[PDB]
Amino acid sequence: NKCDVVVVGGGISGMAAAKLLHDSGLNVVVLEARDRVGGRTYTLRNQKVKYVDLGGSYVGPTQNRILRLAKELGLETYKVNEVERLIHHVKGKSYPFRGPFPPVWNPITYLDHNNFWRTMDDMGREIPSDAPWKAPLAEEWDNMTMKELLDKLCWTESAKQLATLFVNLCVTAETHEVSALWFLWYVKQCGGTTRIISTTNGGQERKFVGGSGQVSERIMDLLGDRVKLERPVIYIDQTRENVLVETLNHEMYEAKYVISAIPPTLGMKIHFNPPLPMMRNQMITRVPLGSVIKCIVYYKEPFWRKKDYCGTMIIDGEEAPVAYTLDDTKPEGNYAAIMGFILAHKARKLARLTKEERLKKLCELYAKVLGSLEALEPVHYEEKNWCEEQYSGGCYTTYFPPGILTQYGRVLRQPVDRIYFAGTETATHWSGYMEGAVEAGERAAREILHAMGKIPEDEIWQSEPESVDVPAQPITTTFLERHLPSVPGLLRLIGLTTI
Amino acid sequence: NKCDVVVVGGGISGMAAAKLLHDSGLNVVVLEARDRVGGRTYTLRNQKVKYVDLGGSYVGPTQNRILRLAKELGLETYKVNEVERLIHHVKGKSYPFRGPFPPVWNPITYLDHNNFWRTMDDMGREIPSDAPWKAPLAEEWDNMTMKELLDKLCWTESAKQLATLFVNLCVTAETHEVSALWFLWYVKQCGGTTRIISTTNGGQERKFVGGSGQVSERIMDLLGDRVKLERPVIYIDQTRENVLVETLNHEMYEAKYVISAIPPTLGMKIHFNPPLPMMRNQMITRVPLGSVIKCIVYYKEPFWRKKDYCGTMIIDGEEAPVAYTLDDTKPEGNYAAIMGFILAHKARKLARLTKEERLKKLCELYAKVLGSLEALEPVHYEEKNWCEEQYSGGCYTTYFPPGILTQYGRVLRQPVDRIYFAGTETATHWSGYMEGAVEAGERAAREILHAMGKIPEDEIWQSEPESVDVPAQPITTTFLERHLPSVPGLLRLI
Ligand SMILES: *Cc1cc2c(cc1C)nc1c(=O)[nH]c(=O)nc-1n2C[C@H](O)[C@H](O)[C@H](O)COP(=O)(O)OP(=O)(O)OC[C@H]1O[C@@H](n2cnc3c(N)ncnc32)[C@H](O)[C@@H]1O
Ligand SMILES: *Cc1cc2c(cc1C)nc1c(=O)[nH]c(=O)nc-1n2C[C@H](O)[C@H](O)[C@H](O)COP(=O)(O)OP(=O)(O)OC[C@H]1O[C@@H](n2cnc3c(N)ncnc32)[C@H](O)[C@@H]1O
Ligand SMILES: CC(C)=CCC/C(C)=C/CC/C(C)=C/CO
Ligand SMILES: CC(C)=CCC/C(C)=C/CC/C(C)=C/CO
């Protein structure tokens, strides 16, 4: 019945919030819709895989909050395999390479590729992390899709195709589905293009030993019976002295404050009294989550390494079911595996097939890309379609269609009376990620601590010391990368000398 | 507890569905979330206004289903005032005119305006009403916003500005918010540009005497205690022999079938067991409703008529709070009034003000446009902001952002086990309107009648005889309208 704070949702964000509040001496209850904690993280255990992340998995340098939280819980990381060459597969052929960006030889195409990535970051520098709608050209950029932006920016098909893949992979949505402003914000708030795309020195550097689901599970262990499973919240009443929160099983919870730690659109599953203010009422119908199937194919050995391939494949083209893969082999070198994502419209199209049909299409793709018949001999397969989850709505995260972020964005983490808002979608650094979940949950908890007079306004937003275990190397560019002209820039230089 | 069919939602669609099933001899229950029926229609009664429609109001020729249903319930219509001149207000000046389309005098601008409207209809002819995702260029058109389309199509700022106003008014959304394919479908399925924009011989020809809320109220009267008010549905369970439907007050209802007669995205307010199939699960997070405040300013007399103005104003520009008005005066000539819409981003911006501040801005605008100081002397004001409604989500209707209709559109009216889908959003003719609500409710009810073996598949979709009271005149074009070149077309001839 009665407590200090009810947290709605037992994903990483809700669990981080609850843990902070609990450590501060308050009585907290976590109401979780599912028969498990973790949300968009899920670690499956069986004898064939030992453990496998079917949801969120990767962490890396500059993600100091998730790293600190997991270390406190007794977790360790290991490095994703990137010793050997990466592969860019374009127009039916594989081109091995090293370094984060797929290289290009054609001088015109080189200028176009260089300019695309540079311009993404240039534009991002004008967008405040904590208030993207404050960018000088916020309106113009928000009223365009990423498809429109790419059409104007990319002078070669080669750059446009790679750029399209980048968007599909970053946000599991099509270029025509998403606001240019929101996407530019999304990349900037992860530290930019290099940081977001990189394995070594980027967002995909590491995974947790034993799975990321242990973060939420081990917090649940600390909280004991304060976490209530199979308690979907259906109703929140703020008309009286104490806030009343009701679940689907008719249980009633009374609290001083509430933290909503669920995807913004999933707030629609709750009936509010009094009704939400107009801007939030409409906002929560305007913010879908992307579409992805995470697929892991198991093999007897990590055979790709013997051909000097690390397992990373960047795969261009409509025909390919998977556009991106990473080596998912255990750090011990056993349970050899390739992880791959089926993205956006392909997730919709291929969900029609059976599990066995999808396994076949993936093996046949990998055999082609890796040039290896061994790829046709899987020993096991695991997969998870996140589009089917009632209490997630999609993965990895929420995207904003054109026009929404400038009109409704300021509403996202604005408290509604005694309801405060967490969830990775409300973060200002690595929003969309486990790191953003920790930032948002802890910030929401501190907002309540301030409302109770326990801390000064000063302490609501707190910086995080850099991890000693996962240090960040700075992002650098070369003189040529900074100053080489764009394609239209070269054409004007050509017009100039005609004098 | 037990019945043949539970209908979720007591708007026109739910009520039309329940009425059909009831008349066929089945036991129906209507579960309505609010303390009233009518949904996106709402008729307010008081001494100052007598009655006023604060939600859906207009009906016209080709809307034969709403007209038949209303007539059966004992309702009459009257004609919206369009005797005198309409006004197009552009760049701070009023230009009176006659006929449905605001005219232009510059020759290049004429070609551009003519081509814009014509192209909207040309493109619409390639889009099947019952399956817009089957259009030959479905993907290309769905991957563009209406803003992009207008940028390519409109060679003059004059046409682009009018076209933008058209989009804002039709679907209460910005051009950059909505899919080009969805918008072209939307116009086509109302019968095209002339039919959708016209008062005389179009969608805005008429209103109901006493208000449109009477449609839902009078069906409630027929159904008696079968309508349950303040019963928001929270849970639907389809795992067992009979479907179980639970409300917020913990009441439990058992049925053979369910009709969901609520806006698609409002399906999110219901927890499903088993979970919805993946496509519907995601679809219902991708389909928002538009933004509008409906505002009615009352005056001692319909003073605009004395200046040979009917009360219709088409008002261009960012500064104007209201882009479109109609005469809302009663057929008797009393309760003189102007109805206006505050649309899309302006609804969001101006909601911050007080009621009195909004009234002042509207009166000042109307004084300018009508060229009359009398507009500064209102006797009364009524307004409704539909963006604040938990059980509507907006108005008039659901819009589709780029990419959604092709990927998720086929899911809209696909049954989920024993749940069938009504609501104006599922109609194929005047979807978005009270007419579409009726079509969809009755079609969903007949789907259940077929599933029960009471009617053949043949009878699920049924044509409607033309109203004798509101006959449709055909839409015509002139030889010059059909064959005059576009601006780029003239440039190639040069
Ligand atoms: C799915 C996914 C996510 C993902 C990604 C790949 C996939 C396939 N890869 C990632 C990666 O490699 N690294 C990373 O950092 N992130 C990655 N992502 C995203 C990541 O998993 C998410 O950002 C993060 O897990 C989100 O955490 P958050 O706490 O903000 O949100 P949640 O996990 O969705 O938790 C919400 C919980 O609330 C419950 N819920 C929902 N509705 C209710 C109601 N009505 N009542 C009570 N509880 C409710 C959910 O069940 C969930 O547990
Ligand atoms: C608001 C509006 C609408 C409108 C328009 C101008 C405005 C400001 N002008 C129109 C016009 O001039 N002519 C016309 O034909 N239409 C016009 N529109 C649109 C029109 O009002 C709508 O298309 C029509 O009313 C829609 O009817 P429908 O039956 O399909 O939908 P509804 O009215 O929204 O009814 C839904 C009912 O369901 C209840 N509800 C919602 N959630 C639940 C739950 N969970 N449980 C039980 N009931 C629920 C709603 O309360 C509503 O009553
Ligand atoms: C290497 C290139 C061209 C693109 C990589 C883009 C990217 C963000 C990959 C990471 C995808 C991922 C694991 C998302 C889940 O957080
Ligand atoms: C005549 C012009 C330029 C625009 C009119 C367009 C239009 C659809 C008007 C009707 C608006 C309305 C009452 C919508 C609600 O159904």
Swiss-Prot record, chain A:
Its main location: mitochondrion. It is a single-pass type IV membrane protein. One of its GO terms (cellular component) is mitochondrial outer membrane. Residues 1-487 are cytoplasmic. Changing C387S: No loss of activity. Its cofactor is FAD. The modification N6-acetyllysine is found at K50. Gene3D superfamilies: 3.90.660.10, 6.10.250.130, FAD/NAD(P)-binding domain (3.50.50.60), Guanine Nucleotide Dissociation Inhibitor, domain 1 (1.10.405.10). Changing C363S: Complete loss of activity. GO terms for biological process: dopamine catabolic process; hydrogen peroxide biosynthetic process; substantia nigra development. The record marks C154, C363, H380 as: Important for catalytic activity. It is an enzyme of class 1 (oxidoreductase). It is found in: Mitochondrion outer membrane. Changing C387A: Complete loss of activity. The keyword RNA-binding does not apply. Its EC number is 1.4.3.21, 1.4.3.4. Changing C190S: No loss of activity. Keywords: Acetylation, FAD, Flavoprotein, Membrane, Mitochondrion, Mitochondrion outer membrane, Oxidoreductase, Transmembrane, Transmembrane helix. The modification S-8alpha-FAD cysteine is found at C395. Inhibited by deprenyl. Disulfide bonds: none annotated. Belongs to the flavin monoamine oxidase family. Monomer, homo- or heterodimer (containing two subunits of similar size). Each subunit contains a covalently bound flavin. Enzymatically active as monomer. This is Amine oxidase [flavin-containing] B.
Swiss-Prot record, chain B:
GO terms for biological process: dopamine catabolic process; hydrogen peroxide biosynthetic process; substantia nigra development. The record marks C154, C363, H380 as: Important for catalytic activity. The modification S-8alpha-FAD cysteine is found at C395. It is an enzyme of class 1 (oxidoreductase). It catalyses: a secondary aliphatic amine + O2 + H2O = a primary amine + an aldehyde + H2O2; (R)-adrenaline + O2 + H2O = (R)-3,4-dihydroxymandelaldehyde + methylamine + H2O2; a primary methyl amine + O2 + H2O = an aldehyde + H2O2 + NH4(+); benzylamine + O2 + H2O = benzaldehyde + H2O2 + NH4(+). Residues 1-487 are cytoplasmic. Keywords: Acetylation, FAD, Flavoprotein, Membrane, Mitochondrion, Mitochondrion outer membrane, Oxidoreductase, Transmembrane, Transmembrane helix. Inhibited by deprenyl. Its main location: mitochondrion. Changing C363S: Complete loss of activity. This is Amine oxidase [flavin-containing] B. It comes from Homo sapiens (Human).
